[PDB]
């Protein structure tokens, strides 16, 4: 109640300071005006104190208690990382996300002073770090507990490594932090592979994927049953990878150990991919501004191996046999204004369309882009009000009036026009 | 009894549409040719140069709603 | 000098970290001293680095350890099986080395090799640069590395394997070659000498982005069984 008094008192003082007149006297009406003007901020501060009452102990003409409460929470979450228990910590982070994300938005805190702005800048870097570590925890750690409990220690260590690498500059929309996260996740997957088997995990030299139907040999390198049958036809007794003379009487079979190990490594890869995808979607592609050129270029590079296509993942260990095309990165880029993303999307199209992944009769490929562009517009329009809808319909009318029309191909501007017309 | 049938709509409907469109009562109608067939065959004014001037890029599409999500989730 | 050997083996024993069964190494190494053994073993001891090795042995097993770099070497260390260590690169190699296996390591490049090194295996390494090969290299194995390059093949390369690298172009296989494996490389084409070989050599070239018309070229050639060249395969399910 003391803190709420201080907050509403500062709001009243500020509002009266802007009264077009001095603060000769501060009457009761101004208090109601303050509540009306700062209702949401005060409710949010109350929500924060309710969720994590401990913040009060840390707290011991401008409204700033909310920003300092947020800073205290980010401190009393970076310090208590994974404590008391991973689930409680993750759940607290989740509960606080909504109020902390509100405080970190320019809309909620319009016009606050410079101390509040600097505090919010730090609270933003802190929240980015906390949220990234929390997503790593939720996807890799919790899953690892149930599926592959043997790795929980390594995942726990890498959590603090991630927190340590993101600390100084946590703007994952820039290049350095993005590469640092990708590098850390790659080291973690590599170490897990070395751990789950002292000879590691390698794909079969025939299929170069995971050794489905795993078959080991006196050389300890792994292959597949079906590939070994196809290889053993005749005159082909020796392994391909090492040229070892197999005993004439040899007969292959499956080792349960390796199939379990492979399944564990696949579950781990799946969790790490989910973490990367969530970090890109939520943290990287968040602002009202696209990430920098280097991040987008790296992401577009990750889709393809040196061509073959794969799902969005920093690991060059899974590949789609046929060149599949998917819409994720396109939807993410289209979250922003087309004017900014045109060159990225046209580079993506020219890259796919470079006989790397498609051959001819591309009418289906263009439809993919058009559909996403259509979705993008619909996504934006659903935010509009009734008068915004009328002004939109008039603008679109004068656009249809202004529209006027190379061959043998299409560009993202032509496809965006086709979508808008549709 | 009903549920077995709905599973096969994606095929059964194009079949019915074909049988209907090719019926004499329809197969000579231009609106039907536009809806079910490719109009380029019978409209010479239609361009045929740019990939954008195909038939499918200018075809309808499913509007996404909450009901359609509900149905997909249940399936 | 035996006392200095005893000192260095017991002191490197003093480096006993977790998992490193260097005590067992001490029984074996002292035994090697006592017999002046021709054969010695240190494999599977999870070791990470080694002290000076006995000089009079002609064989040394160090496989499945965690070694990353090696100490002084015998004069007559003919046969090393160093499969699956963490080696990055190896010291000066001995003269009479007639077989060496360094597969599953992390090596990037090796030095000069003997005249009679009839067998070499570095599968699953990270090699990037290959020096010249001997006249009697009955076997060359480089798969698992990151090579799109290869020096010419020696006169005596009977067995060859090259798969899982990035090879785009291959020198010619001599008449002595009898079993070539070139799977999932980045080869552009397989040259004509590969046909002139005997009618019994297996050549797998599947997984490569080979020239489709070059494929059809081999198609016309293979539909003519009148030639007694080897059997060439380009893909299997
Ligand atoms: Zn296979
Ligand atoms: Zn083998």
């Amino acid at each position: 109640l003391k803190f709420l008094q201080m907050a509403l008192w500062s709001c009243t003082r500020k509002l009266k300071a802007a009264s077009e007149a001095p603060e000769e006297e501060v009457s009761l009406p101004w208090v109601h005006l303050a509540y009306q003007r700062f209702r949401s901020r005060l409710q949010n501060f109350s929500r924060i104190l309710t969720i994590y009452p401990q913040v009060l102990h840390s707290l011991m003409c401008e409204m700033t208690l909310d920003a300092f409460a947020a800073m205290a929470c980010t401190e009393m979450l970076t310090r208590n990382t994974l404590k008391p228990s991973p689930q409680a910590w993750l759940q607290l982070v989740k509960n606080l996300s909504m109020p902390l994300e509100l405080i970190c938005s320019d809309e909620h805190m319009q016009g606050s002073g410079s101390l509040a702005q600097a505090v919010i800048r730090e609270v933003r870097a802190q929240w980015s770090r906390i949220f990234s570590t929390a997503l790593f925890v939720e996807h890799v750690l919790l899953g690892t507990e149930s599926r592959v409990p043997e790795l929980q220690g390594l995942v726990t260590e890498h959590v603090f490594l991630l927190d340590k690498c993101l600390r100084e500059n946590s703007d994952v929309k820039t290049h350095g932090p993005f590469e640092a996260v990708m590098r850390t996740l790659c080291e973690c997957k590599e170490t897990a592979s070395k751990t789950l088997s002292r000879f590691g995990i390698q794909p079969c030299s025939i299929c170069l994927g995971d050794a489905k139907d795993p078959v080991c040999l006196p050389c300890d390198h792994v292959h597949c049953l079906r590939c070994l049958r196809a290889w053993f036809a005749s005159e082909q007794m020796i392994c391909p990878y090492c040229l070892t003379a197999l005993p004439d009487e040899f007969s292959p079979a499956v080792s349960q150990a390796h199939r379990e190990a492979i399944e564990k490594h696949a579950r781990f890869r799946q969790m790490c991919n989910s973490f990367f995808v969530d970090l890109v979607s939520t943290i990287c592609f968040k602002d009202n501004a696209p990430p920098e050129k280097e991040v987008i270029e790296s992401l577009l590079s990750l889709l393809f191996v040196q061509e073959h296509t794969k799902s969005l993942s920093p690991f060059n260990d899974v590949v789609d046999k046929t060149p599949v095309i998917r819409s994720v990165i396109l939807k993410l880029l289209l979250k922003y204004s087309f004017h900014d993303v045109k060159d990225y999307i046209q580079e993506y199209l020219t890259l796919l369309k470079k006989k790397a992944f498609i051959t001819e009769d591309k009418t289906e490929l263009y439809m993919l882009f058009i559909n996403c562009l259509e979705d993008s517009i619909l996504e934006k329009t659903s935010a509009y009000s009734r008068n915004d809808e009328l002004n939109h319909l008039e603008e679109e009318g004068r656009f249809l009036k202004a529209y006027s029309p190379p061959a043998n191909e299409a560009s993202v501007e032509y496809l965006q026009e086709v979508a808008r017309i549709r | 009894v009903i549920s077995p049938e709905l599973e096969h709509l994606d095929k059964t409907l194009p079949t019915m549409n074909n049988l209907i469109s090719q019926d004499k009562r329809i197969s000579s109608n231009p609106v039907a040719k536009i809806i079910y067939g490719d109009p380029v065959t019978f409209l010479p004014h239609l361009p045929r140069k740019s990939v954008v001037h195909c038939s499918k890029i200018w075809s309808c599409r499913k509007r996404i709603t909450v009901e359609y999500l509900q149905h997909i989730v249940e399936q | 000098c035996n006392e200095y050997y005893l000192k260095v083996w017991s002191e490197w024993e003093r480096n006993g970290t977790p998992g490193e069964q260097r005590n067992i190494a001490f029984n074996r190494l002292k035994i090697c001293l006592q017999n002046q053994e021709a054969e010695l073993n240190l494999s599977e001891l999870d070791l990470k680095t080694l002290p000076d090795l006995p000089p009079q042995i002609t064989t040394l097993e160090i496989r499945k350890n965690l070694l990353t770099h090696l100490p002084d070497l015998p004069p007559m260390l003919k046969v090393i099986h160093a499969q699956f260590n963490q080696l990055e690169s190896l010291p000066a190699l001995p003269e009479t080395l007639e077989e060496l296996n360094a597969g599953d390591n992390k090596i990037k490049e090796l030095p000069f090799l003997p005249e009679n090194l009839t067998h070499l295996r570095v599968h699953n390494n990270r090699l990037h640069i290959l020096p010249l090969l001997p006249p009697e290299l009955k076997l060359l194995v480089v798969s698992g590395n990151r090579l799109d390059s290869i020096p010419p093949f020696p006169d005596k390369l009977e067995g060859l394997a090259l798969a899982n690298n990035f090879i785009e172009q291959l020198p010619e296989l001599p008449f002595s070659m009898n079993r070539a494996v070139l799977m999932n490389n980045n080869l552009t084409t397989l040259p004509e000498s590969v046909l002139r070989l005997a009618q019994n050599a297996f050549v797998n070239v599947a997984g490569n982005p080979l020239s489709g018309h070059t494929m059809r070229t081999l198609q016309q050639i293979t539909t003519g069984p009148d030639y007694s060249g080897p059997q060439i395969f380009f893909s299997m399910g």
Side-chain angles (χ1 to χ4, degrees), chain C residues 41-55:
Chain C
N41 183 310
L42 278 94
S43 306
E44 305 135 47
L45 295 191
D46 314 47
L47 306 181
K48 63 179 63 148
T49 33
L50 299 179
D52 304 10
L53 302 132

Side-chain angles (χ1 to χ4, degrees), chain A residues 217-221 223 237-246, chain C residues 123:
Chain A
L217 306 91
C219 197
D220 214 318
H221 50 228
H223 297 323
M237 307 300 322
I238 80 192
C239 210
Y241 213 168
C242 86
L243 308 317
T244 286
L246 258 294
Chain C
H123 43 276

Side-chain angles (χ1 to χ4, degrees), chain A residues 204 206-207 212 224 227:
Chain A
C204 179
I206 275 51
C207 72
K212 30 91 182 79
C224 307
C227 304

Side-chain angles (χ1 to χ4, degrees), chain B residues 33-45:
Chain B
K33 286 185 180 179
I34 289 159
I35 294 161
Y36 295 105
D38 188 349
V40 171
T41 64
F42 83 94
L43 291 176
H45 307 276

Side-chain angles (χ1 to χ4, degrees), chain A residues 363-364 366-367 370-371 374-375 378 410 414-415 418 421-422, chain B residues 49-61 63-64:
Chain A
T363 296
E364 285 296 340
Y366 293 8
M367 276 167 73
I370 290 169
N371 277 280
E374 275 185 313
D375 291 345
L378 279 161
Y414 197 165
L415 301 165
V418 167
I421 293 159
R422 279 175 48 127
Chain B
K49 52 119 164 180
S50 101
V51 184
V52 153
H53 303 151
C54 93
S55 167
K56 194 165 195 155
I57 290 169
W58 293 111
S59 60
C60 284
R61 167 169 134 235
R63 258 290 181 279
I64 298 152

Side-chain angles (χ1 to χ4, degrees), chain A residues 130-171:
Chain A
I130 291 159
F131 196 87
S132 296
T133 288
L135 295 184
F136 181 95
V137 159
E138 186 192 37
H139 291 326
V140 196
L141 192 52
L142 292 185
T144 279
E145 308 197 317
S146 59
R147 267 159 285 183
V148 290
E150 303 96 307
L151 278 162
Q152 198 164 324
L154 178 62
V155 176
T156 295
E157 177 262 9
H158 272 78
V159 187
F160 295 97
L161 302 196
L162 172 58
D163 184 56
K164 182 214 71 217
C165 88
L166 283 175
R167 232 193 275 292
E168 37 263 48
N169 184 22
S170 51
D171 198 4

